[PDB]
RNA sequence: GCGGGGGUUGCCGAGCCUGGUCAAAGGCGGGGGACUCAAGAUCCCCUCCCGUAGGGGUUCCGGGGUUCGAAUCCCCGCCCCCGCACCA
């Protein structure tokens, strides 16, 4: 009712035996089995969500090792980031929120918590508060092989090095344009996290098409936006706003410069969209008004019409009409008041491709003037006529309209007759200081490639060649190596790895972590150097690392980096030689948020660098956890820590807890009661195995047949639970290992009650030595103890796992055991609904002939007659013939089974008395006198009863 | 919009992939009992409708397709949850 003092008191054990640290030589290669898990980013303490992501691989890594297995699972920490940092300073202003995040959730000693002014601080705080509590959890992992990231662990991140720089020699890193939200206070990134509001605005594509004015001296673009590049054909007018004001002024790109006219605050937008904007003259809005501009696209040209319903704010203000289409095309055209100039309500109003000159939608509702209630309307009829939209316009024409919107698109913007503005859904997104968000272009931005499509294949290649967990996600990733364009590996703010090239360049966290599976295949070897100064790091060079990963073995190379790097040749010759024996990684853990990114990277890095035979060789993933129903948030308060919940309840116990839940990607909601629940179950189990402990472990005995069943379930759940786990399956391997083990026990024990000899004894003896053995992974330190209370060798955990046994299997006595079971069903029920008492009831099975016979015939026939054939040619059988209607019956409820002939005996032996005493009432088996029309009044399976 | 997966009995949640043995695993909630003045706790039993002899009827979102037979396989419809990029 306790084991915390037993939890420490093994988890010492492990350690120091060094028990969890394998050894290659220890086994052949394909006996192998190495496995592994996202480190988690050291920021706080993982709550009980990600407590399940690292058991699961701690459960098949014990499971698996007890197999038989040469396993190696190890950890590490990541850190290359960004959070922590930003974290830092938040304390240090002092933030009421953030502080109350450490010192009340994450709970953090008041002091400790001021010294986080110092990222690092935080990076050692947590690091060390997981080691602990992921050793406090009893994870078979290997430390030998353990380290940190960023630039702050020197070889680690020359191993980050080489991994980058050899991904050039594919092309796969290039720089670009770019996109991201943006905080104008004096500079600074918005990860979609700083934003103090709306953080879900979508970045649009608003692309400008610079029509001309050609006026005055010469020329000069009032380059309006539109999210249908399609419209331009249709252009009937511009629109502007007289109200709001706009500017002229020069706006420089890499080298081409001209004269735009658009909204001030499209300037300020544009300032940062990476062109130089020097202003050069303010409007008043009308003013723009009168002059006409032409059609970049066409040759026609236009007038520049006056409006209300165009917004500054939003892109460049100018808008290019076109009523043929877009519903608001006509709001400020349905002119009655008096401006000034007039004589054009006449104008032609063609229109590209339910109707034709649309205008049946808009007045199709209630719209009178200028109201925004047609905000949805207006993007109704985007989408009719995009799915189902024939093209028909002076050019080209037939394909559909998701065509046009990227045949126009892309040749303005190819010749320069249209450039894209970014910009916002919705003006609601503030930054995290104050500031309004905005949004800047970068230029150098790094990037890796994973568009390059022959390495998109090379990936694609693999996964095939992979295994997934669950199977049906399959699709999923298969369908995200498509998906899948340039992902930016690299910042300029917090920890990580700098980039060889580009200093200034921070690797960002998601890109440095795909690799790293290998360098553990090392991480031993060079701790044991790094421990005692005989490591330079810089001698760890991109050079070395390719002979212990790629270069096959030449004596030479060896003896070669001896010097270069300053290590012994015999020394790396064993570090090779262990890369080559650990990889491929047979498996690779996380939770399924990460297969739209990290998951599916991991593939592609691995690919793009790795001999192909030591390609992963399979993905398992795990859903997400609750808690009381209610989501875990770190801001609401309401989340369970790992190490805080390990501690009032137990490892063991928190542990099966969890496989107890769910399997795959399902979700598990941690629910009190249900844990408190599990937990005396535990400590029934934990009793239990103590007392058959007690029990002589004689053997050769003569157990009656109620206990080949106890033993047949246990090689039944001995082999259910072998797949389940073969398999990730932990909620089914828990339900077979556990909660079944643990029903067909106290069944066996109420059907044995008042009894005990030698065999009761040996059953049960031998039933906890292989119970034991099946929980091992689950619950490993209670059992560690209950293994060493019964006859015990060695430690449990490196116990071989029981595999079902020599037959001990009866499918028979299974089946004998469930009719006796129903029988009672049914007695119980035939009192249940009439009769009062009374001290006996009588009832008769069958035989073969009258009977039986039929069944296990009928059940070859499948059918009606050429049964009843097979059957009437036979005497003793056709002796009854108008009673084998029995086949009828029997007919209309399928096939048969095995055939229970003991049966009766079953009904009698060791069943007799049992039976009577549960039921309080006097059996008789196989009578001869006639009861209610008893004697062979019955069907096989189903004996007849009369109770009285 | 691109895309991934789905809808089950009072609820939560299996089972559908290897159709028939599913009235439908498990849990929770509800109820009766051993209890024995009295909180708790363990175990047993019932919980879709009906039933004065072990039975009968209807069930797995709607409608069809396929089959001797579908919660289980195919199609159309409606509906629901999830990632989209530098953010771990």
Redesign the pocket.
Known sequence: LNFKAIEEKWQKRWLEAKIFEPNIRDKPKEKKFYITVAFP?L?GHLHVGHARTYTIPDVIARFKRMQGYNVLFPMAW?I????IVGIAERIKNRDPKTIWIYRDVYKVPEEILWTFEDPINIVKYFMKAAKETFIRAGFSVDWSREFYTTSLFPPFSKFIEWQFWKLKEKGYIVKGA????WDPVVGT?????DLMEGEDVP?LDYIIIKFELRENGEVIYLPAATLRPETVYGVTNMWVNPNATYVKAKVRRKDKEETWIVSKEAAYKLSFQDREIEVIEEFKGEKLIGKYVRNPVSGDEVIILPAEFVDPDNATGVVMSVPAHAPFDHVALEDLKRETEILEKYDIDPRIVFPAVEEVNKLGIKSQKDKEKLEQATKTIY?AE??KGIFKVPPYEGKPVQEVKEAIAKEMLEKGIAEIMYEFAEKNVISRFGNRAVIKIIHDQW?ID?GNPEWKEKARKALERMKILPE??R??FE??ID?????????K??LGTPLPWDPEWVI????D?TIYMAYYTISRHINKLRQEGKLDPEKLTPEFFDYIFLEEFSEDKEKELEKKTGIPAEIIHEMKEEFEYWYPLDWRCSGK??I???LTFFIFNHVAIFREEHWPKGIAVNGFGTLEGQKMSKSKGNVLNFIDAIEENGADVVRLYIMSL?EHD??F?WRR??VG?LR??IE?FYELISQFAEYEVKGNVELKDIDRWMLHRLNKAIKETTNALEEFRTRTAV?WAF?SIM?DL?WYL?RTEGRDDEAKRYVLRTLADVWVRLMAPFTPHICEELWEKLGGEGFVSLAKWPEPVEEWWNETIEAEEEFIR??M??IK??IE???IENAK?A?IYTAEDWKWKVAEVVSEK?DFKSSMEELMKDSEIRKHGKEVAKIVQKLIK?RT?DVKRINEEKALREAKEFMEKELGIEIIINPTEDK?GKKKQ?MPL???????
Request: net charge positive.
């Open positions: 980013y920021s990541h290359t980031g960004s959070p770019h996109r991201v939200r990134p918005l990860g979609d996290h970045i989408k995009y799915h990037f994973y049906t996600r699709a999923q369908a995200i998906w899948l364009d340039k992902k930016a590996c690299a910042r703010i917090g960002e966290s998601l890109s972590s948020d990460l739209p990114n990290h769910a399902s979700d909601d009661k249900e629940k005396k179950q029934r339900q909660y029903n106290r109420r129903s029988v069903e049914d029920e035939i609904v009439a009769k009831r009832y499948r399928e089974f209610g019955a189903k004996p007849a009863i009369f109770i009285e």
